[PDB]
Amino acid sequence: GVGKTVLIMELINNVAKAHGGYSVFAGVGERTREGNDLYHEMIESGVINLKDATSKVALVYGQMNEPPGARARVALTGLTVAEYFRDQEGQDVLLFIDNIFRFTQAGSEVSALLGRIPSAVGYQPTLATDMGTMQERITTTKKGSITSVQAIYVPADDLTD
Amino acid sequence: QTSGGPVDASSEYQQELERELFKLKQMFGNADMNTFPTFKFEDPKFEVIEKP
Amino acid sequence: IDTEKSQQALVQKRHYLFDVQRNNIAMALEVTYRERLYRVYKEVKNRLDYHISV
Amino acid sequence: LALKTIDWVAFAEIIPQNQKAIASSLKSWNETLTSRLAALPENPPAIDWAYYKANVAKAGLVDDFEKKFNALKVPVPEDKYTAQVDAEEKEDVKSCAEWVSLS
């Protein structure tokens, strides 16, 4: 409740609709009513057009009401959509992810049951490696650019988590 | 057996090959790099420097 | 008298005000001349390394 | 490039207050040139052709470039201002030669 979603919606208002290429919003473990708000806001703003093919945003949504597997792989689904728009189209893509912390949190929830000795604060032993294999796909190459804005939740206001 | 087809029977990827040079072209600018470069040479900015 | 002597000394140094303008001009052109020799070489090479990059 | 050294402490005291900004701005332009002039060679490295003669798959382009480049006479700007500032000095010295006479 400090303003991650308000700031990312401000960035969408300022940069996304004023953009030339395409945009991708991957909702990863957040409020479903915020996803509905975003859908209807993009419909009224002409960004998402239900009547023709002039739409400029692709939405991927696995929210906080989803089991941990869906919340762990919906970030990868959004990544894959943006990666197509970067490689096979050469476009300049905007990738918004909110929230990217739910990916790690769902990984921890499932790692509990996968029979793995837990690391610090009870997190999976493979935290940094999974985060790396996910984050190294969100990058600009010489085949296209991906301007990535990711909201990152901080547990208990601890930036050393 | 490519002298007839120079890309060893590419059969695809030409649709994206020209995108590669385009990305490569916007990296070197926009001018047609197949001819000699033009020129316009600038001159310094001067004033009167005497005892006012 | 001595104050009139110094006024002869100060005006003796006058020429520096014109020596700067000469120096500040003479090299100013050399700077443009030198930099002009890049805008030709830095571009013809650019149009050469292109046809070797592609 | 026959530069002339300048004692800035001598330059500092022989300026009148009514034009200190000009002479101070002239100082500003001065050192900015000195480093910029020293921050790049007098002549760029004349690029090779042998690496381009053979490793470029175009005919004529790698020579007519070098031919047109060599046949390109980049104009060096003439002074057209050194004698004009010298026109002031000789007159100034004339105005100051009489002053040291009357003194």
Ligand SMILES: Nc1ncnc2c1ncn2[C@@H]1O[C@H](COP(=O)(O)OP(=O)(O)O)[C@@H](O)[C@H]1O
């Ligand atoms: N830039 C802002 N201007 C005004 N109010 C803000 C701003 N950012 C946050 N707030 C307030 O703080 C609250 C938190 O909003 P939110 O972005 O959803 O936090 P978070 O997503 O991190 O949980 C909002 O309800 C809003 O009232």
Ligand SMILES: [Mg+2]
């Ligand atoms: Mg939020």
